[PDB]
Subunit: 345 residues, 3 copies
């Protein structure tokens, strides 16, 4: 019925993004994606805490899908017979049938094929939503990702100037609700169903035990730091399917930020910290101007430092002393200093 | 002193809205409204939990008032002698005297008449605010609503195009703080004053026990779903007098969203999820393009599914297979499938 | 190497702001500031609760620094030998080295001199960030302030009209996490290090015990209310280094609000309530139109009334009955009233 060309897309694991064009002269295509549900125990923190995760394609977040405005997205959702639970998918990018949820409920051993027209530009959450209390539980178990629908002319600054990224990273932020025993130790379970009742009790109090990027504390630090170079314009897509976040690049800015995540709106310029409303994706462009380590956090610093929500960028390049310089290295305070005359003493 | 024409307005119970014009050629009027305080026990959840509510006109939220820029709003606030508590009203739309609170404190058996000039366009919270700790307690007991001040030319897209709604609904979202006994069961009381001390202890921990639309879990689901038709442009006014919310229409979008709720600002286009800051109203326009059930949620899905914060729209019309279609109904996974070669296994 | 003129700035205690120009015809300068770290026990609430604070210049918040775009900011950070902890500083305004943190770690008895170029306009957080879990702990112990980088032409409305304030106030909002004993009483400690382990446990649950302006409940009420006059345009800078806030001026508005706090973006007009994302500063201009007391709150009214987050403005001037008037003072309800016929009874 459609007859458009069909293009198969091979998804890649976050924080990386499958190859795509920003600007394109190709016409609308049917862009074919496969997502395979995987329930599995995963390690979420640096102490080895495990929890019964439920994922799209084995990762938290699910992979970033990228298409262009006016493409059709044909998703094969697969629920392997090794799974225990029904699953489905809601695309916040899509129109109708609860974002596709009402057309994609599949039992273990089943798959389903949904097509949705990419009529709305931006970054959007996709997440599982089987019904009722199963909706939050599948989402905070890991079952959420994002899709980016680019304008065919690529990004602009909303003032008639093209914007182009050298690199793109997808940061999925996950709130997790891990039960504790009477001693305060995280509990383990043999299956998601066995973890449910105790997890729902934690969920109800609305306070995550962990807030993680790329599915675990430390996922995107040290060896797995995100690479960049001075002069590169980097797009940082950030999603949170359930809970607000306030992203901040420590020692940088958001040059161009779509915090509500929709490219029909002009981005804000020069932000320190932006805001991802729970149930959405946003995006920030930044041109690195200085080398070194940058931390990328939610700027609830308790969440960032103590519940897992810090990533690192390692940026190669030459230091710019005009932007910042240490004028005097740490030195003993002048014995002659008169700090005891200061107005606040 | 004023001499302008006086127009009496009959308020209607949320989520409906009293009849009004969007664009008008009438000049400024004195728009006369009556709000009557009602303290009463109300059922808030589907298990029959009751709590000692305090309301404007017997509803949570209070009714939506609609006037036009440059109208004067003359509110008679009535505090029946059957009430136990002083009450007042703060209009976030109004200028001076703590929004009118400092001019409207009335004991049981009293009424008061306040006039405020509608100088600021948008949707705004109104709420009770008697002083001190009584301010949050009266508000999270139910004593909040909204007023919409339309431009005389009606809504625009901020780019010189008129916007007109076919239908308007008012979604008041209420955080509730219901005490529990040592067993975890919700406690009942014979009066608001008797509930206060235990409720303040819950309030202090900043975690609601319920987050409800139109005063109770399930208020706007099943039989009470909101009606619409394909092709109708629907305005959805959302308020939260105390606590942030992140509205989302599942399977739809916000075509035009004023999340900060003020019509002097151009709306954002094509949002997935928006943000109502506690202490404000916002509004979203959406043109329905697909029939069926839509859920309207705060996209903290735990709040939505587990603490009461889901409404439904039932939309009549023809399905558009071009926007979305089920290409293949659920089927067993191809025995020939090679999902064990997938990159994440 | 730089040779620009050097201008020393004497900081003043919040909520006041050191003298500065809005529009300037001076060229870029090296603006010299000194911040001295002070660890000290401070009183945070009206019951006399103390906690082991850590401050810049003895205040919560740290003082507001004001410079202009293209100035260089040369900060001497001093860590007196009477302190117990290493400290540093991260300027969200600055580019490189984690905002300066990675260049400013100083032990007790040391100082350091950092220069950063003011390339980004707006209000920005600065805060301590020594590393790891010490980052949130130093920030929620008090170690955060703000810097404003004005355009050289001063503020504009983003529509080619100059905006000028008559007065400026800096409201730093602080989330505090004070341990409680088994009885619910706040605990005291002899040193920050002794308070740490019990404070980290409170921090982890993400629910402050206090949310204060200018370092304590009641800091900016009664005798310390903020002064203004009818007709004055007041800039209200609001920062929160760790946690979201929703500012509201009760009986007023935000005429011009930069809630994300960056002057390259046009402000929103006529807001009721705005949103400061944790890790940022924002700013609102308001022209007072009515005299009397205004409360300035976070519009989580529980936080405002019950956890300390209310300031007052006392505004001198003549009452404008056209904007608002009490038409009828409180009176007994007309015996003849027919309120029992009302639709909601
Ligand atoms: O806006 C992107 C895309 O959405 C559609 C619906 O699929 O239009 C919606 O938004 C338009 C612009 O705001 C409105 O004019 C329209 O009424 C609404 O349906 C597409 O038409 C549009 O290309
Ligand atoms: O958090 C309370 C209490 O629980 C203990 C175990 O008894 O540690 C648990 O909690 C810590 C913070 O979440 C985790 O680091 C640890 O993994 C977990 O087992 C106590 O150490 C702690 O005081
Ligand atoms: O903005 C709506 C309405 O508010 C008033 C005050 O009642 O003006 C305020 O905002 C104006 C536009 O931002 C400012 O120019 C003005 O200084 C401020 O008092 C009305 O004048 C206006 O019609
Ligand atoms: O929530 C804790 C604990 O309390 C119990 C009663 O002992 O149930 C209460 O809490 C539930 C969630 O809020 C409610 O559904 C119910 O209405 C309430 O009485 C336990 O069932 C629960 O485990
Ligand atoms: O934007 C203020 C200031 O920031 C700099 C970097 O110091 O520019 C950044 O943002 C510009 C405008 O968005 C971009 O064009 C640029 O690529 C980015 O580095 C300065 O150049 C500018 O004056
Ligand atoms: O808050 C719980 C419980 O603790 C007590 C002391 O036993 O009071 C403490 O908590 C109050 C609220 O935070 C504070 O006003 C007071 O300063 C603090 O000591 C009880 O009174 C209260 O019920
Ligand atoms: O600047 N980072 O917390
Ligand atoms: O798309 N709704 O959770
Ligand atoms: O209007 N203040 O809560
Ligand atoms: Cu699922
Ligand atoms: Cu959703
Ligand atoms: Cu009241
Ligand atoms: Cu209010
Ligand atoms: Cu410090
Ligand atoms: Cu920071």
């Amino acid at each position: 019925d459609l007859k458009l060309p069909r293009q198969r897309v091979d998804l890649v694991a976050p924080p990386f993004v499958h190859v795509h064009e920003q600007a394109t002269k190709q016409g609308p295509k049917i862009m074919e994606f496969k997502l395979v549900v995987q329930e599995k125990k995963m390690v979420i923190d640096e102490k080895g805490t495990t929890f019964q995760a439920m994922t799209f394609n084995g990762s938290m977040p699910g992979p970033l899908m990228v298409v262009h405005e006016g493409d059709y997205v044909e998703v094969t959702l697969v629920n392997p017979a090794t799974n225990t639970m029904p699953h489905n998918i809601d695309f916040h990018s899509a129109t109708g049938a609860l974002g596709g949820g009402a057309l994609t409920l599949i039992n273990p051993g089943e798959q389903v094929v949904l097509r949705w027209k990419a009529t709305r530009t931006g970054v959007f959450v996709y997440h599982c939503a089987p019904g009722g209390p199963m909706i939050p539980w599948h989402v905070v178990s890991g079952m959420n990702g994002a899709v980016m629908v680019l304008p065919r002319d690529g990004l602009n600054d909303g003032h008639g100037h093209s914007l182009r990224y050298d690199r793109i990273y997808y940061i999925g932020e996950q709130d997790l609700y891990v039960p504790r025993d009477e001693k305060g130790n995280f509990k383990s379970y043999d299956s998601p169903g066995e973890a449910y009742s105790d997890t729902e009790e934690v969920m109800r109090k609305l306070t995550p035990t962990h807030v993680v990027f790329n599915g675990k504390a430390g996922a995107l630090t040290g060896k797995n730091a995100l690479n960049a170079n001075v002069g590169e314009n980097v797009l940082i897509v950030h999603s949170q399917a359930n809970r607000d976040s306030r992203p901040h690049l420590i020692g940088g800015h958001g040059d161009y930020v779509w915090e509500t995540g929709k490219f029909s709106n002009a981005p804000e310029t020069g932000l320190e910290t932006w805001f991802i409303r729970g149930g959405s994706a946003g995006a920030a462009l930044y041109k690195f101007l200085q080398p070194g380590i940058y931390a990328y956090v939610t700027h609830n610093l308790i969440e960032a430092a103590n519940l897992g929500a810090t990533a690192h960028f390692k940026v190669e390049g030459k230091w710019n002393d005009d932007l910042m310089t240490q004028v005097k290295a740490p030195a003993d305070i002048p014995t002659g200093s008169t700090n005891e005359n200061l107005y606040f003493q």
